Design a protein around this motif. Structure first.
Motif, PDB file in Angstrom:
ATOM      1  N   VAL A   6      -0.020   3.760   0.536  1.00 34.18           N
ATOM      2  CA  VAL A   6      -0.004   2.831  -0.582  1.00 34.18           C
ATOM      3  C   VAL A   6       1.443   2.429  -0.830  1.00 34.18           C
ATOM      4  N   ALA A   7       1.637   1.188  -1.271  1.00 31.02           N
ATOM      5  CA  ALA A   7       2.952   0.715  -1.664  1.00 31.02           C
ATOM      6  C   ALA A   7       2.784  -0.264  -2.807  1.00 31.02           C
ATOM      7  N   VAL A   8       3.779  -0.301  -3.678  1.00 34.27           N
ATOM      8  CA  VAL A   8       3.781  -1.228  -4.795  1.00 34.27           C
ATOM      9  C   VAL A   8       5.126  -1.924  -4.800  1.00 34.27           C
ATOM     10  N   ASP A   9       5.147  -3.114  -5.367  1.00 33.45           N
ATOM     11  CA  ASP A   9       6.388  -3.843  -5.596  1.00 33.45           C
ATOM     12  C   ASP A   9       6.706  -3.864  -7.093  1.00 33.45           C
ATOM     13  N   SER A  10       7.786  -4.566  -7.453  1.00 32.12           N
ATOM     14  CA  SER A  10       8.260  -4.547  -8.834  1.00 32.12           C
ATOM     15  C   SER A  10       7.328  -5.271  -9.795  1.00 32.12           C
ATOM     16  N   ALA A  11       6.400  -6.072  -9.287  1.00 25.57           N
ATOM     17  CA  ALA A  11       5.453  -6.790 -10.122  1.00 25.57           C
ATOM     18  C   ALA A  11       4.170  -6.015 -10.372  1.00 25.57           C
ATOM     19  N   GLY A  12       3.964  -4.893  -9.694  1.00 28.24           N
ATOM     20  CA  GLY A  12       2.717  -4.167  -9.816  1.00 28.24           C
ATOM     21  C   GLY A  12       1.647  -4.600  -8.844  1.00 28.24           C
ATOM     22  N   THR A  13       1.997  -5.381  -7.831  1.00 26.11           N
ATOM     23  CA  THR A  13       1.062  -5.628  -6.753  1.00 26.11           C
ATOM     24  C   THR A  13       0.964  -4.386  -5.874  1.00 26.11           C
ATOM     25  N   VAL A  14      -0.257  -4.060  -5.460  1.00 26.31           N
ATOM     26  CA  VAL A  14      -0.552  -2.821  -4.748  1.00 26.31           C
ATOM     27  C   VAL A  14      -1.109  -3.154  -3.379  1.00 26.31           C
ATOM     28  N   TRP A  15      -0.552  -2.518  -2.355  1.00 23.65           N
ATOM     29  CA  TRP A  15      -1.035  -2.628  -0.990  1.00 23.65           C
ATOM     30  C   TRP A  15      -1.516  -1.255  -0.549  1.00 23.65           C
ATOM     31  N   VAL A  16      -2.676  -1.200   0.104  1.00 24.78           N
ATOM     32  CA  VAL A  16      -3.273   0.060   0.550  1.00 24.78           C
ATOM     33  C   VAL A  16      -3.698  -0.063   2.009  1.00 24.78           C
ATOM     34  N   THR A  17      -3.313   0.914   2.831  1.00 28.50           N
ATOM     35  CA  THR A  17      -3.846   0.984   4.190  1.00 28.50           C
ATOM     36  C   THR A  17      -5.241   1.590   4.136  1.00 28.50           C
ATOM     37  N   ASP A  18      -6.242   0.759   4.417  1.00 28.49           N
ATOM     38  CA  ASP A  18      -7.646   1.160   4.401  1.00 28.49           C
ATOM     39  C   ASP A  18      -7.952   1.671   5.805  1.00 28.49           C
ATOM     40  N   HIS A  19      -7.517   2.912   6.029  1.00 30.70           N
ATOM     41  CA  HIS A  19      -7.419   3.519   7.357  1.00 30.70           C
ATOM     42  C   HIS A  19      -8.739   3.458   8.117  1.00 30.70           C
ATOM     43  N   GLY A  20      -9.840   3.818   7.459  1.00 30.02           N
ATOM     44  CA  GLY A  20     -11.123   3.838   8.142  1.00 30.02           C
ATOM     45  C   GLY A  20     -11.667   2.470   8.496  1.00 30.02           C
ATOM     46  N   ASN A  21     -11.139   1.407   7.886  1.00 28.64           N
ATOM     47  CA  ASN A  21     -11.574   0.050   8.188  1.00 28.64           C
ATOM     48  C   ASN A  21     -10.517  -0.740   8.945  1.00 28.64           C
ATOM     49  N   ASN A  22      -9.469  -0.071   9.425  1.00 27.37           N
ATOM     50  CA  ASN A  22      -8.456  -0.694  10.273  1.00 27.37           C
ATOM     51  C   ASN A  22      -7.910  -1.966   9.634  1.00 27.37           C
ATOM     52  N   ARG A  23      -7.605  -1.886   8.337  1.00 30.17           N
ATOM     53  CA  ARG A  23      -7.111  -3.050   7.617  1.00 30.17           C
ATOM     54  C   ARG A  23      -6.197  -2.607   6.480  1.00 30.17           C
ATOM     55  N   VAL A  24      -5.424  -3.558   5.973  1.00 26.53           N
ATOM     56  CA  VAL A  24      -4.588  -3.376   4.792  1.00 26.53           C
ATOM     57  C   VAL A  24      -5.132  -4.295   3.709  1.00 26.53           C
ATOM     58  N   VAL A  25      -5.382  -3.747   2.526  1.00 25.33           N
ATOM     59  CA  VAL A  25      -5.874  -4.551   1.414  1.00 25.33           C
ATOM     60  C   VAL A  25      -4.790  -4.637   0.354  1.00 25.33           C
ATOM     61  N   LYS A  26      -4.909  -5.658  -0.480  1.00 27.24           N
ATOM     62  CA  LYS A  26      -3.917  -5.965  -1.500  1.00 27.24           C
ATOM     63  C   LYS A  26      -4.609  -6.319  -2.807  1.00 27.24           C
ATOM     64  N   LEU A  27      -4.059  -5.821  -3.914  1.00 25.11           N
ATOM     65  CA  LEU A  27      -4.446  -6.217  -5.266  1.00 25.11           C
ATOM     66  C   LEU A  27      -3.210  -6.784  -5.950  1.00 25.11           C
ATOM     67  N   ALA A  28      -3.147  -8.117  -6.024  1.00 29.01           N
ATOM     68  CA  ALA A  28      -2.050  -8.791  -6.704  1.00 29.01           C
ATOM     69  C   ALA A  28      -2.009  -8.372  -8.161  1.00 29.01           C
ATOM     70  N   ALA A  29      -0.796  -8.208  -8.679  1.00 26.84           N
ATOM     71  CA  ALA A  29      -0.616  -7.906 -10.088  1.00 26.84           C
ATOM     72  C   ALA A  29      -1.420  -8.876 -10.942  1.00 26.84           C
ATOM     73  N   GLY A  30      -2.188  -8.324 -11.886  1.00 32.08           N
ATOM     74  CA  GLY A  30      -3.023  -9.099 -12.774  1.00 32.08           C
ATOM     75  C   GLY A  30      -4.394  -9.435 -12.232  1.00 32.08           C
ATOM     76  N   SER A  31      -4.577  -9.374 -10.922  1.00 36.75           N
ATOM     77  CA  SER A  31      -5.848  -9.710 -10.310  1.00 36.75           C
ATOM     78  C   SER A  31      -6.751  -8.484 -10.263  1.00 36.75           C
ATOM     79  N   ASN A  32      -8.045  -8.737 -10.183  1.00 39.92           N
ATOM     80  CA  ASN A  32      -9.006  -7.660 -10.085  1.00 39.92           C
ATOM     81  C   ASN A  32      -9.807  -7.715  -8.796  1.00 39.92           C
ATOM     82  N   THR A  33      -9.554  -8.699  -7.931  1.00 39.93           N
ATOM     83  CA  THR A  33     -10.259  -8.824  -6.658  1.00 39.93           C
ATOM     84  C   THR A  33      -9.261  -8.705  -5.509  1.00 39.93           C
ATOM     85  N   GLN A  34      -9.508  -7.749  -4.631  1.00 37.90           N
ATOM     86  CA  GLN A  34      -8.613  -7.509  -3.516  1.00 37.90           C
ATOM     87  C   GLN A  34      -8.663  -8.652  -2.501  1.00 37.90           C
TER      88      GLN A  34
END
Length: 251
Positions: free
Chosen positions: A94-122
């Motif tokens: 997992v990693a976050v930036d200064s705005a609160g956007t979150v990136w997650v390595t979704d290891h079992g699905n061979n993908r990286v997902v993102k939740l932009a700050a303020g958003s509720n849909t990846q």
């Protein structure tokens, strides 16, 4: 640190506080900036937590690997928040930036997902050809580096781009963590070879850091001075190599 068992993720804040996923004990431990003051975060129900990330405000995000979720705890709060990610499987980095956007390595699905700050849909980042990816790192631009662990490589995607770049690291074996600084230097835990390597932003040949006695190192984090922290997972310790030094220290 004391009492760590199989530590995995490490995160460091701009103030210099260090958080570690005490993965074998299903907790996150913290070492306050400039002291030996250890505290333990009041997370509940974690199972084999992997990654950890922190922002300037002391909010900590943890990938709850066994429960397929990402949990956030604000500084001084007794209430954890399960983020609205969906469909995760054994998430790792997992990693976050200064705005609160979150990136997650979704290891079992061979993908990286993102939740932009303020958003509720990846959103799913358009990486391709990943296999069992692990670490993830982001810079202030939203460029994302992912440790493509199953393919022994590190891959970069500029934000909004559909071009991914394979970094010219050499001899990586089951790599785990990745970290980047404000200068574009990239560090990678070469877990299979018990070493940490780095690539500067405008260079084509890696540097190998003079860590010694690492065993299955996992997480890595860096600050703007180029000081590196590594979770020496096999030796239940966090090691630190300051900028310009050949002598590691143990936290």
């Amino acid at each position: 640190f004391t009492g760590l068992n199989t530590p995995s993720g490490v995160a460091v804040d701009s103030a210099g506080t260090v958080w570690v996923t005490d993965h074998g004990n299903n907790r996150v431990v913290k070492l306050a900036a400039g002291s030996n003051t250890q505290t333990v975060l009041p997370f509940t129900g974690l199972n084999t937590p992997s990654g950890v990330a922190v922002d300037s405000a002391g909010t900590v995000w943890v990938t709850d690997h066994g429960n397929n979720r990402v949990v956030k705890l604000a500084a001084g709060s007794n209430t954890q928040t399960v983020l609205p990610f969906t469909g995760l499987n054994t998430p790792s980095g997992v990693a976050v930036d200064s705005a609160g956007t979150v990136w997650v390595t979704d290891h079992g699905n061979n993908r990286v997902v993102k939740l932009a700050a303020g958003s509720n849909t990846q959103t799913v980042l358009p990486f391709t050809g990943l296999n069992t990816p692990s670490g993830v790192a982001v810079d202030s631009a939203g460029t994302v580096w992912v440790t493509d662990h199953g393919n022994n490589r590190v891959v970069k995607l500029a934000a909004g781009s559909n071009t991914q770049t394979v970094l010219p690291f050499t001899g990586l074996n089951t790599p785990s963590g990745v970290a980047v600084d404000s200068a574009g230097t990239v560090w990678v835990t070469d877990h299979g070879n018990n070493r940490v390597v780095k690539l500067a932003a405008g260079s084509n040949t890696q540097t190998v850091l003079p860590f010694t006695g690492l065993n299955t190192p996992s997480g890595v984090a860096v600050d703007s001075a180029g000081t590196v922290w590594v979770t020496d997972h096999g030796n239940n310790r966090v090691v630190k190599l300051a900028a310009g030094s050949n002598t590691q220290t143990v936290l």
